Amino acid sequence: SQWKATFPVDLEIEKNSEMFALRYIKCASAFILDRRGILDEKCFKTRTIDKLLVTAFQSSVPAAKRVSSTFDGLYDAIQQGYLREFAIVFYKKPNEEDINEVFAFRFAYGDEGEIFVSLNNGIDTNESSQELLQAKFVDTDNTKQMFASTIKKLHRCIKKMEPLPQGSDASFRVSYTEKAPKDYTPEGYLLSPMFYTLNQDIRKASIGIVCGGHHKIQMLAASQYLKQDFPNMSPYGLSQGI
């Protein structure tokens, strides 16, 4: 039930920061997929992290084990400094380009300096990239508190969303840093020329940035199901694992 049952401590250390970064995106993904109704409810279990009720995959369920396992190849992508963004996108087949909702996790490594703002795809903006640059590691306890604050804000955002359309589809999409080789593909993902693009008028929400010592992870959302821009108290990649 304590932090250390789920996440590393001593987050200033590179290996602990890496492991935290991967476990964090997996944790938030389970929270999101459960609350938005993507998989059957038996794919999830509620767990406790300090004062918060969070969600985990139930790996004894095949569909959950499949989704959980997609994260394994992202660990090497994070270790090598190759993962720039992990995004969960919701759409309706057959139109895989028409993104109704996205939850994006953008990474900054060490003190990278500045990061290119994409002009034609994604969710990032000049403002979001400035916020990611300005965020800084402070200490492990502070990251415990910022995790809690961020999950609470994610919960409040999702409470303001209308339900996904019946039978929505979901995919995981990833983009890479300039260090990654030209045809880089994490295990479990497929190489794709396509990422995702959003409509100019979609409503957006900035949920928060959590930091390990060597990794900063920014969560940004966009949805047609938010009305306006926005208890749990105790060279791209594609995965169609969902």
Numbering used by the authors: 19 to 248, 258 to 261, 278 to 285
Reported in the publication:
HORMADs were named after the first proteins in this family to be discovered in budding yeast: Hop1, Rev7, and Mad2 and meiotic HORMADs are essential to organize meiotic chromosomes for the meiosis-specific events of homolog pairing, synapsis, and recombination. Meiotic HORMAD proteins have a characteristic N-terminal HORMA domain that allows HORMADs to adopt two different conformations: a closed conformation and an open/unlocked conformation. In the closed conformation, a peptide on a binding partner called the “closure motif” binds the core of the HORMAD’s HORMA domain. This interaction is stabilized by a C-terminal region of the HORMA domain called the safety belt, which wraps around the HORMAD to lock the binding partner’s closure motif against the HORMA domain core.
Using CRISPR/Cas9 gene editing, we made a corresponding missense mutation to the htp-3H96Y allele in him-3, where arginine 93 was replaced with a tyrosine (him-3R93Y). While the closure motif for HTP-3 is unknown, HIM-3 is known to bind closure motifs found within the C-terminal tail of HTP-3. We cloned and expressed wildtype HIM-3 and HIM-3R93Y in E. coli, purified each protein, and performed a fluorescence polarization peptide binding assay to test how well HIM-3R93Y binds a peptide encoding HTP-3 closure motif #4 in vitro. Consistent with prior work, we found that wildtype HIM-3 binds the HTP-3 closure motif with a Kd of 220 +/- 20 nM and found that it does not bind to a control peptide with a scrambled sequence. HIM-3R93Y binds to the same closure motif with an increased Kd of 690 +/- 130 nM, indicating that HIM-3R93Y binds the HTP-3 closure motif with reduced affinity compared to wildtype HIM-3. The thermal stability of HIM-3R93Y is similar to that of wild-type HIM-3, and a crystal structure of HIM-3R93Y in the closed conformation is equivalent to that of wildtype HIM-3, suggesting that reduced affinity for the closure motif for HIM-3R93Y is not due to instability of the protein or an inability to adopt the closed conformation. These results demonstrate that HIM-3R93Y binds the HTP-3 closure motif less readily than wildtype HIM-3, which would potentially limit its ability to adopt the closed conformation in vivo. Right panels show the position of residue 93 and show that the overall HORMA domain structure is not impacted upon mutation of arginine 93 to tyrosine. Similar to pch-2 single mutants, we found that there was an increase of nuclei with 5 GFP::COSA-1 foci in him-3R93Y mutants compared to wildtype controls (10%, p value = 0.0004 by two-tailed Fisher’s exact test), showing that mutation of this residue in HIM-3 causes a loss of crossover assurance. Therefore, him-3R93Y suppresses the defect in crossover assurance observed in pch-2 mutants.
